[PDB]
Amino acid sequence: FTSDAKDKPIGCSVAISTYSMLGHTTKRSWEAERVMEWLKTQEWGLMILDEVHTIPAKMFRRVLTIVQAHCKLGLTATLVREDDKIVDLNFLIGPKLYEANWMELQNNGYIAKVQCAEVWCPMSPEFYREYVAIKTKKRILLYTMNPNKFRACQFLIKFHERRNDKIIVFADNVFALKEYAIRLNKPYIYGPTSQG
DNA sequence: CTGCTCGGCTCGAGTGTTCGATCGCGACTGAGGACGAACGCGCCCCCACCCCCTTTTATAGGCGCCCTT
């Protein structure tokens, strides 16, 4: 039940959809409206919700009441957030039945052991000068882009590329991500990035 | 009354989204033109049977050509 592509949602029972579509608050297309009415009318034996940590959000939580289900199972890997809305999950879905032990899984080999590291990059003198001088929040784009760390990520990626290690670079700022990706001629994914 | 503080508001940018536009193809059809296939008519070829060929003696009339007058 996805806007990008659909497979006759009313035709079959087992369905996979998204919080955004089910809890969509604005005008609904005709076909999506028919599908939504069918979903509301029918009763679901199981309601699986992945990444439950986002459920207590307004629109996402509205889906719980929008759809009817006997048991709504919740699955996730990071059940933590700052706002004290995680406690709301206990009643929104139910009590937390289990939490896997990451260290025990690492010992058992079910999960690859990770050598977690934090590379400290000294900020370049000029960049620090403007960063400290300006009280605005251009610092997000500034300290994210400094010669010491730009050289660092490039060098780290080169070292792992010659080591045949698969790299997944991450960056919150789409602007910085695009700049780094164009400078390193790499395939950045972000924002609109067509599904195809 | 003043000072400090708490978790209620708001923020732009980053995402997840979506309904609406533009651009695009494809698909289809009309008339006209063009080409191919099929059938009709005529032709040559092939296959049969039948006639005619010579040689003989008699005949009489007709016909033709050559020779003589």
Side-chain angles (χ1 to χ4, degrees):
Chain A
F1 179 34
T2 318
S3 172
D4 289 301
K6 294 196 184 77
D7 305 336
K8 307 288 283 187
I10 298 152
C12 71
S13 78
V14 172
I16 303 168
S17 198
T18 72
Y19 304 125
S20 309
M21 176 156 252
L22 282 71
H24 193 193
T25 59
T26 51
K27 199 250 174 183
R28 189 87 274 181
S29 87
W30 168 86
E31 191 273 334
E33 181 63 32
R34 299 300 99 192
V35 171
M36 184 180 286
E37 287 296 334
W38 174 73
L39 298 163
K40 290 163 166 272
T41 47
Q42 203 146 28
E43 308 174 1
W44 297 99
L46 182 68
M47 182 157 167
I48 290 151
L49 309 179
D50 74 346
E51 310 289 356
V52 289
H53 51 86
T54 52
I55 288 287
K58 286 168 71 62
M59 179 174 73
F60 298 168
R61 95 196 299 160
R62 289 285 181 288
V63 177
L64 299 156
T65 62
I66 279 160
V67 191
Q68 299 181 0
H70 292 256
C71 65
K72 50 183 79 70
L73 186 65
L75 285 85
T76 186
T78 80
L79 198 151
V80 290
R81 209 159 52 187
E82 278 57 17
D83 50 353
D84 288 314
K85 273 165 198 71
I86 288 292
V87 300
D88 288 340
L89 291 170
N90 286 296
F91 83 89
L92 287 171
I93 284 161
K96 312 170 191 178
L97 310 155
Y98 196 78
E99 300 186 11
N101 184 344
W102 291 39
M103 302 297 287
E104 201 157 4
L105 296 176
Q106 285 198 143
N107 292 125
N108 308 342
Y110 308 132
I111 284 161
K113 180 68 69 64
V114 175
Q115 182 67 236
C116 287
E118 188 189 348
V119 167
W120 287 37
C121 304
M123 178 161 262
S124 52
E126 43 261 23
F127 282 56
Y128 201 105
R129 293 182 183 174
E130 292 83 4
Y131 158 88
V132 71
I134 71 183
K135 279 215 171 187
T136 66
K137 282 282 159 61
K138 182 66 72 65
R139 52 189 73 170
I140 294 92
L141 190 149
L142 192 51
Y143 61 67
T144 284
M145 290 166 57
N146 59 359
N148 281 104
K149 170 203 307 176
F150 192 109
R151 285 173 57 86
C153 79
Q154 192 180 346
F155 168 80
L156 285 152
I157 294 156
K158 264 176 181 190
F159 184 85
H160 295 302
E161 274 198 328
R162 68 182 78 174
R163 213 160 161 287
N164 289 319
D165 287 314
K166 295 284 194 181
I167 308 103
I168 309 183
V169 177
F170 276 79
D172 164 38
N173 190 352
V174 65
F175 182 83
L177 181 64
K178 294 221 269 191
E179 288 214 4
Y180 279 47
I182 61 185
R183 289 183 161 286
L184 278 71
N185 64 23
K186 254 71 175 177
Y188 63 103
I189 295 157
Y190 70 108
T193 296
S194 60
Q195 211 286 337

Short mmCIF file of all heavy atoms in Angstrom, two decimals, chain A residues 123 127 130-132 134-146 149 171-177 180, chain B residues 12-14:
data_model
loop_
_atom_site.label_atom_id
_atom_site.label_comp_id
_atom_site.label_asym_id
_atom_site.label_seq_id
_atom_site.Cartn_x
_atom_site.Cartn_y
_atom_site.Cartn_z
N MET A 123 40.44 21.63 14.72
CA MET A 123 39.87 22.60 13.80
C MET A 123 40.95 23.53 13.28
O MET A 123 41.87 23.92 14.01
CB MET A 123 38.78 23.42 14.49
CG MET A 123 38.18 24.50 13.61
SD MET A 123 36.58 25.08 14.20
CE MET A 123 35.47 24.11 13.18
N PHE A 127 39.11 28.71 10.33
CA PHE A 127 37.76 28.21 10.49
C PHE A 127 37.28 28.39 11.92
O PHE A 127 36.15 28.83 12.16
CB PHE A 127 37.69 26.73 10.09
CG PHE A 127 37.67 26.50 8.61
CD1 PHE A 127 38.68 27.00 7.81
CD2 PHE A 127 36.65 25.78 8.02
CE1 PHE A 127 38.67 26.79 6.44
CE2 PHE A 127 36.63 25.56 6.66
CZ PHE A 127 37.64 26.07 5.87
N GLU A 130 36.36 32.23 12.48
CA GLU A 130 35.00 32.62 12.10
C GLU A 130 33.96 31.90 12.94
O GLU A 130 32.95 32.51 13.33
CB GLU A 130 34.71 32.40 10.60
CG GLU A 130 35.49 33.31 9.63
CD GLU A 130 36.88 32.83 9.30
OE1 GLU A 130 37.25 31.75 9.76
OE2 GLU A 130 37.61 33.57 8.60
N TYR A 131 34.17 30.62 13.23
CA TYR A 131 33.18 29.87 14.02
C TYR A 131 32.93 30.55 15.36
O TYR A 131 31.77 30.77 15.74
CB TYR A 131 33.68 28.44 14.22
CG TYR A 131 33.06 27.72 15.40
CD1 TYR A 131 31.87 27.03 15.26
CD2 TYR A 131 33.66 27.75 16.65
CE1 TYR A 131 31.30 26.37 16.34
CE2 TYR A 131 33.10 27.10 17.73
CZ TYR A 131 31.92 26.41 17.57
OH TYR A 131 31.35 25.76 18.64
N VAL A 132 33.99 30.90 16.08
CA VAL A 132 33.83 31.53 17.39
C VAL A 132 33.34 32.97 17.23
O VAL A 132 32.54 33.45 18.04
CB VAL A 132 35.14 31.46 18.18
CG1 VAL A 132 36.20 32.38 17.59
CG2 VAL A 132 34.90 31.80 19.65
N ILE A 134 31.36 34.37 14.97
CA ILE A 134 29.94 34.47 14.64
C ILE A 134 29.14 33.76 15.73
O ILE A 134 29.42 32.61 16.07
CB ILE A 134 29.65 33.89 13.25
CG1 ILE A 134 29.78 32.36 13.25
CG2 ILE A 134 30.57 34.52 12.21
CD1 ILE A 134 29.57 31.73 11.89
N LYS A 135 28.15 34.46 16.28
CA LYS A 135 27.22 33.88 17.24
C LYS A 135 26.02 33.24 16.57
O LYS A 135 25.18 32.65 17.26
CB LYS A 135 26.74 34.95 18.23
CG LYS A 135 27.72 35.23 19.37
CD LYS A 135 26.99 35.55 20.66
CE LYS A 135 27.93 35.62 21.84
NZ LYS A 135 27.20 35.76 23.14
N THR A 136 25.91 33.33 15.25
CA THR A 136 24.82 32.71 14.51
C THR A 136 25.08 31.20 14.45
O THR A 136 26.02 30.68 15.05
CB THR A 136 24.69 33.33 13.13
OG1 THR A 136 25.85 33.02 12.35
CG2 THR A 136 24.53 34.84 13.23
N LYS A 137 24.24 30.48 13.70
CA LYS A 137 24.34 29.03 13.60
C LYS A 137 24.80 28.59 12.21
O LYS A 137 24.41 27.51 11.74
CB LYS A 137 23.01 28.38 13.97
CG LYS A 137 22.78 28.33 15.47
CD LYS A 137 23.56 27.20 16.11
CE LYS A 137 23.76 27.43 17.60
NZ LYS A 137 22.47 27.51 18.33
N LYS A 138 25.62 29.40 11.55
CA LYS A 138 26.37 28.91 10.40
C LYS A 138 27.42 27.89 10.81
O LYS A 138 27.99 27.21 9.95
CB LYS A 138 27.02 30.09 9.67
CG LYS A 138 27.79 29.73 8.40
CD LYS A 138 26.88 29.19 7.30
CE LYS A 138 26.02 30.29 6.69
NZ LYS A 138 26.84 31.31 5.96
N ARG A 139 27.68 27.76 12.12
CA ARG A 139 28.66 26.79 12.59
C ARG A 139 28.30 25.37 12.16
O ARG A 139 29.19 24.56 11.93
CB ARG A 139 28.79 26.87 14.11
CG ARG A 139 27.47 26.79 14.87
CD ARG A 139 27.68 27.11 16.34
NE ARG A 139 27.92 28.53 16.56
CZ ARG A 139 27.93 29.12 17.75
NH1 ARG A 139 27.72 28.41 18.85
NH2 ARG A 139 28.16 30.42 17.84
N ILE A 140 27.01 25.06 12.03
CA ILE A 140 26.63 23.71 11.60
C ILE A 140 27.24 23.39 10.25
O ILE A 140 27.77 22.30 10.03
CB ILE A 140 25.09 23.57 11.59
CG1 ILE A 140 24.53 23.67 13.01
CG2 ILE A 140 24.69 22.24 10.94
CD1 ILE A 140 24.13 25.06 13.42
N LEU A 141 27.18 24.34 9.31
CA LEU A 141 27.82 24.16 8.01
C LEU A 141 29.32 24.38 8.07
O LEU A 141 30.04 23.88 7.19
CB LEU A 141 27.19 25.11 6.99
CG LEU A 141 27.56 24.91 5.52
CD1 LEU A 141 26.39 25.33 4.63
CD2 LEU A 141 28.81 25.69 5.14
N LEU A 142 29.82 25.12 9.06
CA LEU A 142 31.24 25.45 9.14
C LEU A 142 32.07 24.30 9.72
O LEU A 142 32.95 23.76 9.03
CB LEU A 142 31.43 26.71 9.99
CG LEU A 142 32.81 27.37 9.96
CD1 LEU A 142 33.31 27.61 8.54
CD2 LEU A 142 32.79 28.67 10.74
N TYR A 143 31.81 23.92 10.97
CA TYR A 143 32.61 22.87 11.60
C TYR A 143 32.40 21.51 10.94
O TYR A 143 33.29 20.66 11.01
CB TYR A 143 32.33 22.78 13.11
CG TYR A 143 30.90 22.45 13.51
CD1 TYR A 143 30.35 21.20 13.24
CD2 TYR A 143 30.14 23.36 14.22
CE1 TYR A 143 29.06 20.89 13.61
CE2 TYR A 143 28.84 23.06 14.60
CZ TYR A 143 28.31 21.82 14.30
OH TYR A 143 27.02 21.52 14.69
N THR A 144 31.25 21.29 10.32
CA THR A 144 31.06 20.08 9.53
C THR A 144 31.99 20.04 8.33
O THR A 144 32.30 18.95 7.83
CB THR A 144 29.60 19.97 9.07
OG1 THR A 144 28.78 19.57 10.17
CG2 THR A 144 29.46 18.97 7.93
N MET A 145 32.46 21.20 7.86
CA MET A 145 33.34 21.31 6.71
C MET A 145 34.59 22.08 7.13
O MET A 145 34.63 23.31 7.05
CB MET A 145 32.63 22.02 5.56
CG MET A 145 31.52 21.21 4.92
SD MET A 145 30.48 22.23 3.85
CE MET A 145 31.69 22.89 2.72
N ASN A 146 35.60 21.35 7.58
CA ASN A 146 36.89 21.93 7.89
C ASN A 146 37.99 21.11 7.24
O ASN A 146 37.82 19.91 7.00
CB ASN A 146 37.13 22.00 9.41
CG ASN A 146 37.07 20.65 10.07
OD1 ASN A 146 36.83 19.64 9.42
ND2 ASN A 146 37.29 20.62 11.39
N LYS A 149 39.13 17.67 9.05
CA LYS A 149 38.18 16.53 8.96
C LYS A 149 37.85 16.21 7.50
O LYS A 149 37.62 15.02 7.20
CB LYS A 149 36.92 16.77 9.80
CG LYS A 149 35.78 15.78 9.61
CD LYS A 149 34.43 16.35 10.00
CE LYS A 149 34.41 16.92 11.40
NZ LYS A 149 33.11 17.55 11.71
N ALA A 171 25.76 11.90 7.08
CA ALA A 171 25.81 13.33 7.31
C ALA A 171 24.40 13.90 7.37
O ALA A 171 23.60 13.70 6.44
CB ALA A 171 26.61 14.03 6.21
N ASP A 172 24.07 14.62 8.45
CA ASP A 172 22.74 15.18 8.59
C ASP A 172 22.50 16.31 7.59
O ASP A 172 21.42 16.40 6.99
CB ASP A 172 22.52 15.68 10.01
CG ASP A 172 21.33 16.62 10.14
OD1 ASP A 172 20.31 16.38 9.46
OD2 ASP A 172 21.42 17.60 10.90
N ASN A 173 23.49 17.18 7.40
CA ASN A 173 23.34 18.34 6.52
C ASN A 173 23.40 17.87 5.07
O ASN A 173 24.44 17.38 4.61
CB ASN A 173 24.44 19.37 6.81
CG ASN A 173 24.19 20.69 6.10
OD1 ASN A 173 23.29 20.80 5.28
ND2 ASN A 173 25.01 21.68 6.42
N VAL A 174 22.29 18.03 4.35
CA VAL A 174 22.25 17.63 2.95
C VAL A 174 23.22 18.49 2.13
O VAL A 174 23.83 18.01 1.18
CB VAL A 174 20.82 17.72 2.40
CG1 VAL A 174 20.32 19.16 2.40
CG2 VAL A 174 20.75 17.12 1.00
N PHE A 175 23.36 19.77 2.49
CA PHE A 175 24.28 20.64 1.78
C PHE A 175 25.71 20.13 1.89
O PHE A 175 26.42 20.00 0.88
CB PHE A 175 24.17 22.06 2.34
CG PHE A 175 25.04 23.07 1.65
CD1 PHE A 175 24.64 23.67 0.47
CD2 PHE A 175 26.27 23.42 2.18
CE1 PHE A 175 25.44 24.60 -0.17
CE2 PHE A 175 27.08 24.35 1.55
CZ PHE A 175 26.66 24.94 0.38
N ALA A 176 26.15 19.82 3.11
CA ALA A 176 27.50 19.29 3.30
C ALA A 176 27.65 17.93 2.63
O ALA A 176 28.70 17.64 2.05
CB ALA A 176 27.81 19.18 4.80
N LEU A 177 26.61 17.09 2.71
CA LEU A 177 26.67 15.79 2.06
C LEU A 177 26.87 15.94 0.56
O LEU A 177 27.72 15.26 -0.04
CB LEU A 177 25.39 15.01 2.36
CG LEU A 177 25.29 13.60 1.77
CD1 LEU A 177 26.37 12.71 2.37
CD2 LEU A 177 23.91 13.02 2.00
N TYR A 180 30.51 17.24 -0.20
CA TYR A 180 31.49 16.17 -0.07
C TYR A 180 31.35 15.16 -1.21
O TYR A 180 32.35 14.70 -1.76
CB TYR A 180 31.31 15.47 1.28
CG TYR A 180 31.96 16.19 2.44
CD1 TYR A 180 31.79 17.56 2.62
CD2 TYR A 180 32.73 15.50 3.37
CE1 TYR A 180 32.37 18.22 3.69
CE2 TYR A 180 33.32 16.15 4.43
CZ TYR A 180 33.14 17.51 4.59
OH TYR A 180 33.72 18.16 5.65
P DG B 12 10.65 29.72 10.62
OP1 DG B 12 10.13 31.07 10.30
OP2 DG B 12 9.73 28.56 10.64
"O5'" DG B 12 11.85 29.39 9.62
"C5'" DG B 12 13.12 30.06 9.73
"C4'" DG B 12 14.25 29.07 9.54
"O4'" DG B 12 14.25 28.11 10.62
"C3'" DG B 12 14.19 28.27 8.24
"O3'" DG B 12 15.48 28.25 7.62
"C2'" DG B 12 13.80 26.87 8.69
"C1'" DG B 12 14.36 26.80 10.09
N9 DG B 12 13.63 25.90 10.99
C8 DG B 12 12.27 25.90 11.23
N7 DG B 12 11.91 24.98 12.09
C5 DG B 12 13.10 24.35 12.43
C6 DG B 12 13.34 23.27 13.32
O6 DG B 12 12.53 22.64 14.01
N1 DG B 12 14.69 22.93 13.36
C2 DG B 12 15.68 23.56 12.65
N2 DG B 12 16.92 23.09 12.83
N3 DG B 12 15.47 24.56 11.82
C4 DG B 12 14.16 24.90 11.76
P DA B 13 15.65 27.73 6.12
OP1 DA B 13 16.67 28.58 5.45
OP2 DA B 13 14.30 27.58 5.52
"O5'" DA B 13 16.28 26.27 6.32
"C5'" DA B 13 17.54 26.10 6.98
"C4'" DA B 13 17.71 24.66 7.41
"O4'" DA B 13 16.70 24.31 8.38
"C3'" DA B 13 17.60 23.63 6.27
"O3'" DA B 13 18.80 22.86 6.18
"C2'" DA B 13 16.45 22.73 6.69
"C1'" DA B 13 16.31 22.97 8.18
N9 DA B 13 14.95 22.82 8.68
C8 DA B 13 13.83 23.50 8.28
N7 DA B 13 12.74 23.14 8.91
C5 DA B 13 13.17 22.13 9.77
C6 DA B 13 12.49 21.33 10.70
N6 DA B 13 11.18 21.42 10.94
N1 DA B 13 13.21 20.42 11.39
C2 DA B 13 14.53 20.33 11.15
N3 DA B 13 15.28 21.03 10.30
C4 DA B 13 14.53 21.92 9.63
P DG B 14 19.03 21.89 4.92
OP1 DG B 14 20.50 21.72 4.75
OP2 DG B 14 18.21 22.39 3.79
"O5'" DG B 14 18.43 20.50 5.42
"C5'" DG B 14 19.28 19.53 6.07
"C4'" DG B 14 18.46 18.37 6.59
"O4'" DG B 14 17.41 18.86 7.45
"C3'" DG B 14 17.72 17.56 5.53
"O3'" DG B 14 18.52 16.51 4.99
"C2'" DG B 14 16.56 16.97 6.31
"C1'" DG B 14 16.38 17.88 7.52
N9 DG B 14 15.10 18.57 7.54
C8 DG B 14 14.73 19.67 6.80
N7 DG B 14 13.50 20.05 7.02
C5 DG B 14 13.02 19.13 7.95
C6 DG B 14 11.75 19.03 8.56
O6 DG B 14 10.75 19.75 8.40
N1 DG B 14 11.69 17.96 9.44
C2 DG B 14 12.72 17.09 9.70
N2 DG B 14 12.47 16.11 10.58
N3 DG B 14 13.91 17.17 9.13
C4 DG B 14 13.99 18.21 8.27
#
